[PDB]
Write a protein that binds this ligand. Structure first.
Ligand SMILES: Nc1nc(=O)c2cc(CNc3ccc(C(=O)N[C@@H](CCC(=O)O)C(=O)O)cc3)cnc2[nH]1
Ligand SMILES: Nc1nc(=O)c2cc(CNc3ccc(C(=O)N[C@@H](CCC(=O)O)C(=O)O)cc3)cnc2[nH]1
Ligand SMILES: [Ca+2]
Ligand SMILES: [Cl-]
Ligand SMILES: [Cl-]
Lengths: 159, 159
């Protein structure tokens, strides 16, 4: 099945012009844990932001332009993206906005990290209706010596 | 000679206990390049923020408390911290606030990162009178896809 994974600040802000103003090693640790050994689909801007391929996962880039790196798979359509995943039990889509909006309709699960940060954003997570999703796990944490803001992990499944 | 190295937000606010709300890999690289192969003196809150010995550096912890860990050197006073460094050309003091207050008077140099971020905070880097310090190097950088905010590296020499 297809799942979406994202970190949302207040108002569902997911990206800004520059790097997000927070330092959340535990959030990254949760992202890794939930994506390891799975194929991940991302857009080009997100790829460019990451820098290198995500270790231990099959990296698939969805983009209309030509591929720039031989260490990943470049695809041109959603259909192409899915097919390239092969036969695995769960596909993870990691953004950005556009990619999230194109994949939401086929998604059965959301892994979200709500961060308590108020920022002006450039892109946002698509609007989802809470009456359509069931919260099956939630866990709140305050900022600490290593995390700059408080955050809450949440997993939702489509009703 | 003794040097202080710090990251300052607007109005000289520095970290107290929770991690600071920014993400500046360029600044951590600067921190690393300037402290590598040298001894570093820090307080107990900085030690928890770091979470493990800085590699390639002699880690000295100044604190009233007990040395939980064996990989670093635990001291109870400034004089003890200094002696622990032995005979080297430059000692790096890495914070926090009280630790900066204590070594400032003996400091000959300051490596500061001025970050364009408004953070609400209790602690401040000690007041330095720039007429007692000569700014000798200043280099500004804009925020980018990797750096959450604008920052400026600056080195000051005690006159
Ligand atoms: N929960 C969540 N948090 C995020 O920061 C996030 C980021 C993206 C897209 N950008 C990124 C940028 C860096 C890394 C990253 O470096 N991941 C490393 C983390 C280091 C670790 O897990 O020890 C990785 O191996 O996954 C991942 C995704 C998508 N969904 C998200 N979802
Ligand atoms: N300029 C400056 N920047 C800072 O971020 C800063 C932080 C402290 C104390 N806090 C910290 C927290 C983490 C690391 C740390 O993990 N440093 C690694 C670099 C890892 C990396 O560049 O990804 C190191 O090896 O120095 C250092 C100090 C003291 N002076 C500062 N001074
Ligand atoms: Ca529930
Ligand atoms: Cl993208
Ligand atoms: Cl401290």
């Amino acid at each position: 099945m297809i799942s979406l994974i994202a970190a949302l600040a207040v108002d569902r802000v997911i990206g800004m012009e520059n790097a997000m103003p927070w330092n959340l090693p535990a959030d990254l640790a949760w992202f890794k844990r939930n994506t390891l050994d799975k194929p991940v689909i991302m857009g080009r801007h997100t790829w460019e932001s990451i820098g290198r391929p995500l270790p231990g996962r099959k990296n698939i880039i969805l983009s209309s332009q030509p591929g720039t790196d031989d260490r990943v798979t470049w695809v041109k359509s959603v259909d192409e993206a899915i097919a390239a995943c092969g036969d695995v039990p769960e596909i993870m889509v990691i953004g950005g906005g556009r990619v999230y909006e194109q994949f939401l309709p086929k998604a059965q699960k959301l892994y979200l990290t709500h961060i308590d940060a108020e920022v002006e954003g450039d892109t946002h997570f698509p609007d989802y209706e809470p009456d359509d999703w069931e919260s099956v796990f939630s866990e709140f944490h305050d900022a600490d010596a290593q995390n700059s803001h408080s955050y809450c992990f949440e997993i939702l499944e489509r009703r």
